[PDB]
């Protein structure tokens, strides 16, 4: 495949929920993850190159595989432990799945992580969409 590179930015926030009883003295926290695309100047723009995003959460969660179809694909959950996870992003026009490793952790109140992905140029609608975020 001919491909182009794009940087996506994963944004995470978390805060303690004091009304939830701590579990084994560990507080329960509310947390969220969203995903934006960066353009070639570094500005956040809606990640419309993805048809859907699936968060593959730690197996302790009820229904750990959460599907979203509208940018910024925001997920909200509660828990008491950090964990690694994979985020599946599905490019437009069945152009392919990319697995993006993330770590959900409580080290900061909010933090951002950038990932470069390679996107094919063989689906006209996706190719047109990619022109919004940089050269193709």
């Amino acid at each position: 495949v001919a491909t182009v590179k794009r940087t996506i930015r994963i944004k995470t926030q978390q805060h303690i929920l004091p009304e939830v009883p701590p579990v084994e003295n560990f507080p329960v926290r509310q947390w969220s993850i969203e995903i934006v695309l960066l353009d070639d100047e570094g500005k956040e723009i809606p990640a419309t190159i993805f048809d859907k995003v699936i968060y593959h959460l730690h197996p302790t969660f009820a229904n750990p595989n959460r599907t979203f179809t509208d940018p910024p694909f925001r997920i909200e959950e509660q828990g008491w432990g950090g964990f690694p996870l994979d985020i599946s992003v599905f490019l437009l026009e069945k152009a392919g799945e990319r697995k993006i490793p993330h770590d959900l952790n409580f080290l900061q109140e909010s933090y951002e992580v950038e990932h470069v992905i390679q996107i094919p140029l063989n689906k006209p609608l996706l190719t047109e969409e990619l022109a919004k975020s940089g050269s193709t």
């Binding site: 560990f26 730690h58 302790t60 828990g79 008491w80 432990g81 950090g82 964990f83 952790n105 409580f106 080290l107 900061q108």
Partner: peptide, 5 residues
């Protein structure tokens, strides 16, 4: 803040 599962 270092809590892991």
């Amino acid at each position: 803040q270092t809590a892991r599962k």
